[PDB]
């Protein structure tokens, strides 16, 4: 579908081909995060630290509960119906997340039946197992620090020092928490927040949180690094200071008739100057349709591209024509730096700008020369079994394309400038030229 | 001022209206940060750690003092005058910050009268109160770690182990500090650095630092997250290794005749294809003047937009015409992804592309159909009291606009492509077309 032979002559060498995968079909599991530690074993050295901490934390947590109440108070069974008049203004994603929240409230009630047990936990990780329905894990922030550092040093340091250490630890915890759970979180009715971000309520240790789930899969790291494991806040307690979070754990599904092709850019020679083609380096092909892809939001592995949603974007007709073999429509830009790549290797064959770099044949010792009419040279073992480029020596294979590659020649597109200020300069100059041409007709 | 009815027909649904607030009128307060801990209670296990640490820290701190001296040595009372010849080259902001520095120098001298007391502090947070004018808080980095961990374990571990632990803690502190206080700090004569960044000299615990100020306000978190609380370095001591920082604490003032309007994008149907309008989603209106806003630098809350400065930017005449009702000038882009939103809710009324998603009327059970000549459908309770879209069931209100919304029709603008490479491709193609038209006249 792409014309690789013509593209290689303007410095676009064929790279690795990769699969396309997107998350789908998530499982759900609920967990409790308690945001105040249990200080019952050091109660004589607490002062008024806990009261001030509770005031600050309540100030942080109140708006989240307020935002959840908007959907909680206006959703009832019919199979569930939302009151559109009461909601007023909302996106589709927000309404869908509200439906999910209503679904989760059923297990939230069963969990909240364990309030007294939740309040009395004294370890960093605890599994509460009362009945088949009343079972949940509880994770408590800063409990490990208190149990390991402060309790063992009682009466080795003064009570005043212990109190100050506790206060500083709580203040540092709040300083770290505010970025994720502060005013930046104006839309808690959603399921797009990553588990890594949610884990900041537990000091950023998402490994332990995921271990409590008990899952097992070979795509675990790929799921994590593609930001596909998310969570949603379902319930906030303003008297015991804990939250309930539902975690969504999906699988990765491969799109069948799709692939993503990478292109490696190499500088080429034209008119005693060095140039680089301005073409997207990743191209998505789905059912023989060509498009761009916003690959900056995806995860690139050796064998596949993994995304949490479809990131395809449209492409202009001229660019699609350039990719299919019309090289006179492929733009180019001048090279004024020494860091631009000068050669590449594809399927055992070398593509090199031997005007800009020294190319030698190790088999015979003779130099490899490029004429002024050639953009770059293809080197395989029909002409040089072993090539030398600087300090690099490479043994080469055979080219599967045309046997007359180096004697054909290609048509060259127009130059462009890609700097941000230069874009405005070019737009203004073109508009002025258009105005001149327009006023020539009137006169 | 905006033509919401016409805009909704090209998928721009009216969203929340918000207020506009900017910081002003700051109060000032000075504090001391000591960057070397007091090791007098473990002096037998220090080795040569402090000497090496002091050498490294002096290397870090010397350029900052050098940069401050440029303004300190060239400013005198007249009501203060700067020697422009000696300064040489400076922006207006730098000169204003220099004036502020000269103003702070008096309280700096008063604080520096407490040098011996500052050097002898042995706790993480201390309040020195000698006279009404000689009063200041001192915050000492790593003192809590030394007091809580290293001192209590003396002779429980070897002196060599204690020394190594102290050295590693100091090295980690320097590794964290270098990003904020290293060569990236070319211009210390300014008051734009946030308090969060400054708190890195105290381990990143800005909550405690702000608590020492003693202020109280309901907009505290909004001030913090909008990056409106800043600080300026006023004095550096290269023999005791401490700095004096002046903190600026402003209020938020609302611009009276201004508001910011949000637009929610929804895909629409035209010529058997799906499209989205390319229009800014946030619009600033001030005294009935329309402009863009660089909202990425601001804080968006439920009721207002909060910024540390005025981020208004100009808008083209064609875009302003598009927003006021001339929809043939609003550009559009093709949709090739399944993630684009297909419906939205505004003031209890549904705007939905029912060609792309299934729409059903729950009251009667009959389907809701959209013709090929309609971009999207408005759904209120005159036609369907309760609507079903997938797994979503919504009860609806009444539309306050025209009663003939679904039978009028609108004019459609031209398509565009927004990819970065496609921009250069389009510019080059337009220039080539212009050249062809120009040369047609000559011949």
């Amino acid at each position, epitope marked *: 579908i792409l014309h690789y032979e013509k593209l290689s002559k303007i410095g676009l060498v064929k790279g690795v081909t990769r699969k396309y995968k997107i998350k789908s079909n998530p499982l759900t599991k609920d967990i409790v995060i308690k945001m105040i530690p249990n200080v019952s074993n050091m109660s*004589q050295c607490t002062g*008024s*630290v806990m009261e001030n901490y509770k005031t600050r934390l309540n100030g942080i947590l109140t708006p989240i509960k307020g935002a959840l109440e908007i959907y909680k108070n206006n959703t009832h069974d019919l199979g569930v119906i939302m009151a559109g008049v009461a909601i007023g203004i909302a996106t589709a994603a927000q309404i869908t997340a509200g439906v999910a929240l209503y679904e989760a409230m059923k297990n939230a009630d069963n969990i909240n039946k364990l309030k007294s047990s939740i309040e009395s936990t004294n370890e960093a990780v605890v599994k509460l197992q009362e009945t088949a329905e009343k079972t949940v894990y509880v994770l408590t922030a800063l409990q490990d620090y208190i149990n390991t550092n402060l309790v063992p040093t009682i009466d080795k340091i003064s009570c005043k020092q212990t109190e100050l250490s506790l206060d500083l630890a709580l203040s540092k915890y709040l300083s770290d928490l505010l970025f994720v759970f502060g005013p930046n979180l104006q839309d808690p009715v959603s399921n797009s927040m990553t588990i890594q971000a949610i884990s900041q309520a537990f000091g950023g240790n998402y490994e332990t949180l995921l271990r409590t789930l008990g899952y097992a899969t070979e795509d675990f790291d790929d799921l994590l690094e593609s930001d596909s494991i998310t969570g949603q806040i379902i319930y906030v307690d303003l008297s015991s200071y804990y939250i309930i979070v539902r975690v969504y754990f999906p699988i990765l599904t491969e799109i069948q008739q799709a692939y993503i092709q990478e292109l490696l850019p190499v500088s080429f020679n034209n008119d005693n100057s060095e140039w680089i083609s301005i073409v997207p380096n990743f191209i998505l092909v789905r059912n023989t349709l060509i498009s761009n892809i916003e690959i900056g939001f995806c995860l690139i592995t050796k064998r596949s591209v993994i995304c949490n949603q479809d990131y395809a974007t449209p492409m202009t007709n001229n660019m699609r024509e350039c990719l299919t073999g019309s090289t006179e429509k492929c733009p180019r830009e001048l090279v004024v730096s020494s860091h631009v790549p000068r050669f590449a290797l594809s399927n055992g064959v070398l593509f090199a700008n031997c005007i800009s770099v020294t190319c030698q044949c190790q088999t015979t010792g003779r130099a490899i020369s490029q004429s002024g009419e050639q953009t770059l040279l293809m080197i395989d073992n029909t002409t040089c079994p072993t090539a030398v480029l600087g300090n690099v020596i490479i043994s080469l294979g055979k080219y599967l394309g045309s046997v007359n590659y180096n004697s054909e020649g290609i048509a060259i597109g127009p130059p462009v400038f890609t700097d941000k200020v230069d874009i405005s300069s070019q737009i203004s100059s073109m508009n002025q030229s258009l105005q001149q041409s327009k006023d020539y007709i009137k006169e | 001022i905006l033509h919401y009815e016409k805009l909704s027909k090209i998928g721009l649904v009216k969203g929340v209206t918000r207020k506009y607030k900017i910081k002003s009128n700051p109060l000032t307060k000075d504090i001391v940060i000591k960057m070397i801990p007091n090791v007098s209670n473990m002096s037998q296990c220090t080795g040569s750690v402090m000497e090496n640490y002091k050498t490294r820290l002096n290397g870090i701190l010397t350029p900052i003092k050098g940069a401050l001296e440029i303004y300190k040595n060239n400013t005198h009372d007249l009501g203060v005058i700067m020697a422009g010849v000696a300064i040489g080259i400076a922006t207006a902001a730098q000169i204003t910050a220099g004036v502020a520095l000269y103003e702070a120098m008096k309280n700096a001298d008063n604080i520096n009268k407490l040098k011996s007391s500052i050097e002898s502090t042995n706790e993480a947070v201390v309040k020195l109160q000698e*006279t009404a004018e000689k009063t200041v808080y001192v915050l000492t980095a790593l003192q809590d770690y030394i007091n809580t961990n290293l001192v209590p374990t003396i002779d429980k571990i070897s002196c060599k182990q204690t020394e190594l632990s102290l050295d590693l803690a100091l090295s980690k502190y320097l590794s964290d500090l270098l990003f904020v206080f290293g060569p990236n700090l070319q211009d210390p004569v300014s008051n734009s650095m946030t308090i969060q960044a400054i708190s890195q000299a105290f381990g990143g615990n800005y909550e405690t630092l702000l608590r*020492t100020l003693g202020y109280a306000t309901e907009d505290f978190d909004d001030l913090l997250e909008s990056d409106s609380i800043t600080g300026q370095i006023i004095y550096v001591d290269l023999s005791s290794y401490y700095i004096i920082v002046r903190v600026y604490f402003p209020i938020l003032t609302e611009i009276q005749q201004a508001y910011i309007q949000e637009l929610l994008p929804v895909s629409f149907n035209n010529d058997n294809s799906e499209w989205i309008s390319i229009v800014p989603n946030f619009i600033l209106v001030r005294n009935t003047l329309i402009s863009n806003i660089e909202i990425g630098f601001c804080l968006i809350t439920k009721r207002s937009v909060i910024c540390n400065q005025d981020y208004a930017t100009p808008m083209t005449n064609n875009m302003r015409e598009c927003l006021t009702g001339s929809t043939e000038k609003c550009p559009r882009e093709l949709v090739v992804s399944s993630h684009v939103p297909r419906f939205a809710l505004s003031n209890g009324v549904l705007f939905a592309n029912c060609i792309s998603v299934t729409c059903q009327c729950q009251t009667t059970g009959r389907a809701i159909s959209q013709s090929g000549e309609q971009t999207l459908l408005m759904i209120d309770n005159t036609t369907c009291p309760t609507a079903v879209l997938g797994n979503v069931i919504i009860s609806l209100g009444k539309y306050l606009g025209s009663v003939n919304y679904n039978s009028e029709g609108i004019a459609i603008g031209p398509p565009v492509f927004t990819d970065k490479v496609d921009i250069s491709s389009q510019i080059s193609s337009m220039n080539q077309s212009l050249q062809q038209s120009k040369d047609y006249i000559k011949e």
Partner: antibody
Amino acid sequence: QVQLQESGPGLVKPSETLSLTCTVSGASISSYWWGWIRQPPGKGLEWIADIYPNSGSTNYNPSLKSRVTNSKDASKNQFSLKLSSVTAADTAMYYCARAPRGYSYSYVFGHRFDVWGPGVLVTVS
Amino acid sequence: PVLTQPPSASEAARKSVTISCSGSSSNIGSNSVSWYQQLPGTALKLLISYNDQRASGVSDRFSGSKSGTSASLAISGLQTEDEADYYCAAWDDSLSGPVFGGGTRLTVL
């Protein structure tokens, strides 16, 4: 409102042991610090001891440390003090009080007796 | 160990008076001061804590201050109901407890 009541013997013979009891109404003794103070007739106040019943912690005035014992009873919400080998110098008015201490919001450390009992007079004769 | 107060103080009505309290580095230099009032034949009550914070239901005519190893209590708009004894106290790090002053009796003319 928290209220405290002292109780003890009106007259204590020399070289015997003085026993005092403080009864609290409106709060649990196991969630606060408490303290004992005394004032000789016509003189100033003197601190005796502070106690935290929940963990059994105690701080003593160094002059009186060797003659002071403390006890508690959570069922009746009471705490008791005992001073042994009393002389004529131990006649005074005795008070129990609630004694919170700690850092303020602005990191200033302080101690205070915020609620006082009526007090009981003890005469050694 | 002990804090130093003046045994007596006196000032006419509608005037203002100041009572001083002197200590050391272990108690007043590093910690705050509390002030208590004792009226004739009634229970003691807490007037001031944390060097300047008045208790609930305490008139604004009472103020406190601290400088160095010394502290002061100021009474303005002097009235007849202010005749009492006044005591200062401060936490001492070497004792893990409070130390008291000798007390000052206030007489109004």
